[PDB]
Structure 1
Amino acid sequence: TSIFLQEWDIPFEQLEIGELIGKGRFGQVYHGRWGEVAIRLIDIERDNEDQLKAFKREVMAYRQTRHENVVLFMGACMSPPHLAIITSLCKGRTLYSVVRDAKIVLDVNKTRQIAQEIVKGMGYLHAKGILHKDLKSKNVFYDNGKVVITDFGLFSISGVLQREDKLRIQNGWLCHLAPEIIRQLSPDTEEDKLPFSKHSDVFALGTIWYELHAREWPFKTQPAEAIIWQMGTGMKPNLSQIGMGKEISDILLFCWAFEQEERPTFTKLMDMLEKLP
């Protein structure tokens, strides 16, 4: 009914909670001291006990994770109604902030390298049988060539969807969802029962690949309902309007494939990215 932070391999004596790092739909993310750390405080309503019973299992799954491209999960303590997820602190900037900065230059070679790093981390998480299901440029950090993935698996227990018969969509969420997920969305759909898969995470990476070159999300102009229909029927943009070669456009064609089984695995995707100019 509780998880102690003395159950963790990271030896824990004291934890200092600092300032808030930023605004976020899922809990509050504060600075921390352990070395500096990132503490995410969450509240559980003390209902769906069996769902948080699975939250504990998913957290213990994080314990077996360690990879240079995946944020170091360091511990988690649960004294209901309060939970806390403690991960290593990422210095640098989110890929969201980097991609939208005028001074930062993003040639084709660095975008190939940034993508390969995210693929390597996701390939590890898939090999360990872990689905990230909320891959965005706000959950990838970039510090002068160091690329780390963040917030994997949180979306299942997130509760970011919660009006009466009206589902909440944030700006960049829809364009990362594969068509099989988009066709499921409903005002009373919940994050725990959405058909996520390894193919859906590959689709989310395809969105990031578009974001790396266009340096903006796909379907930027259009409202949420138009995005839902266009993505559900399989309409997807390309990168030719900015002069990107076929090599860089084939990445999207494979990752954004309408049928799940046509999307490559991350190992195969790593091969594909190796063969770019």
Structure 2
Amino acid sequence: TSIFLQEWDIPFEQLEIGELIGKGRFGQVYHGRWGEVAIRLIDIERDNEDQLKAFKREVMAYRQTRHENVVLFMGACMSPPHLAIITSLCKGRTLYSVVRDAKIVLDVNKTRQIAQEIVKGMGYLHAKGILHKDLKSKNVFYDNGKVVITDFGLFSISGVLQREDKLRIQNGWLCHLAPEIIRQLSPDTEEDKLPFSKHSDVFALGTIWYELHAREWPFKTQPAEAIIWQMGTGMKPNLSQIGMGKEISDILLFCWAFEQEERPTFTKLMDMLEKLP
């Protein structure tokens, strides 16, 4: 019914909580001291206690993870109604902030390398049997060539959808969802029961690949309802309007494939990215 912090392999003596790092839909993220650390405080309503113990096993699954491209899960303590997820602190800035910085060059070579790093980390998480379910630029950190993935698996326990008969969509969420998921969205759909898969994570990386070169999300102009219908019927943009070659556009065509089985695995995707000019 509870998880303690002495259960963890990281030797834990004291934990200092500092300033808030930023606003977020899921919990609060504070600075911490252990070395510096990142603390995410979550609250549980003391209901769906079977979904609660499933959260415990998903956390114990995080324990067996260690990879250079994956944020270091360091601990998690649970004293209901309060939960806390403690991960290593990422220096630098999020890929979302880097891609939207005019003072930073993103040539084709660096974008190929950044993509390959995310693929390596996502391949590790898939090999360990872990779905990210919320891969995006705000959950990737880049510090002068160091690329780390963040916030994998939180979406299952998240509750970011919570009006009457009206589902909340934030701007960048829809364009990362594969068509099989987009067709499922409903005003009373919940994150725990959405058909996520390894193919859906590959679709989300395809969105990041578009974002790396266009320096903006796809469907930037259009409202949410138009995005839902267009992505559901399988309409997708390309990168030729900015003058990108076929090699860089084939990446999208494979990752954004309408049928799940046509999307490559991350190992195959790593092969494809190695062969770019």
* TM-score, structure 2 as length reference: 1.00
Pairwise CA distance, 1:254: 0.1
Aligned residues: 277
User: Aligned-pair distance for 1:270?
Assistant: 0.1
Superposed CA deviations along residues 59-86 of structure 1, whole A, max 9, x for unmatched, are 0000000000000000000000000000
User: Partner of 1:168: helix, strand, or coil?
Assistant: strand
C-alpha displacement of 1:23: 0.5
The Cα shift of 1:211 comes to: 0.1
- C-alpha distance in structure 1 between counterparts of 2:21 and 2:138, whole Å: 13
Distance 2:153 2:48 in 1: 18
State the shift of 1:246 in Å: 0.1
Superposed CA RMSD: 0.2
Deviation at 1:199, TM superposition (A): 0.1
Cα distance in 2 for residues equivalent to 1:104 and 1:166: 39
Q: Alpha-carbon deviation of 1:103?
A: 0.1
Shift of 1:257: 0.1
Aligned residue for 1:184?
184
Q: Post-superposition shift, 1:119?
A: 0.1
Structure 1 consecutive aligned stretches of length 4 or more whose deviation exceeds 6 Å: none
Post-superposition Cα deviations, 1:16-57, rounded to whole Å, max 9, x if no partner, equal: 000000010000000000000000000000000000110000
Distance 2:173 2:164 in 1: 20
Q: Report deviation, 1:206.
A: 0.1
CA distance in 2, matches of 1:51, 1:115: 34
Q: By how many angstroms is 1:12 displaced?
A: 0.2
1:92-119 per-position Cα deviation (integer Å, ceiling 9, x unaligned): 0000000000000000000000000000
Query: Secondary structure at the residue paired with 1:5?
Result: coil
In 2, Cα distance between the equivalents of 1:267 and 1:15?
A: 38
Instruction: Measure, in 2, the Cα distance between the counterparts of 1:171 and 1:10.
Output: 37
Q: CA deviation at 1:124?
A: 0.1
- Quote the Cα distance in structure 2 between the aligned partners of 1:217 and 1:194: 23
Q: How does 1:141-220 map to 2 (within 5 A)?
A: 141-220=141-220
Could you state the TM-score of these two structures normalised by the residue count of structure 1? 1.00
The DSSP-based 3-state class of the residue aligned with 2:185 is coil
Q: Matched residues in 2 for 1:145 and 1:228: separation?
A: 35
- The runs of 5 or more residues in structure 2 that have no matched partner are none
SS in 1 for 2:147: strand
The alpha carbon displacement at 1:237 in A equals 0.2
Distance 2:230 2:40 in 1: 35
SS in structure 2 of the partner of residue 7 of structure 1: coil
CA-to-aligned-CA distance 1:131-190 (integer Å, 9 cap, x gap):
000001000000000000000000000000000000000000000000000000000000
| Secondary structure, counterpart of 2:115 in structure 1 | helix
Q: Distance in 1 between matches of 2:260 and 2:23?
A: 34
**In 2: Cα distance, 1:233 partner to 1:93 partner:** 35
Matched with 1:225 is 225
Q: Which runs of 5+ in 1 are unaligned?
A: none
Distance in 2 separating the partners of 1:31 and 1:234 = 42
Measured in 2, the distance between the counterparts of 1:133 and 1:49 equals 22
Q: SS state of the match for residue 142, structure 2?
A: strand
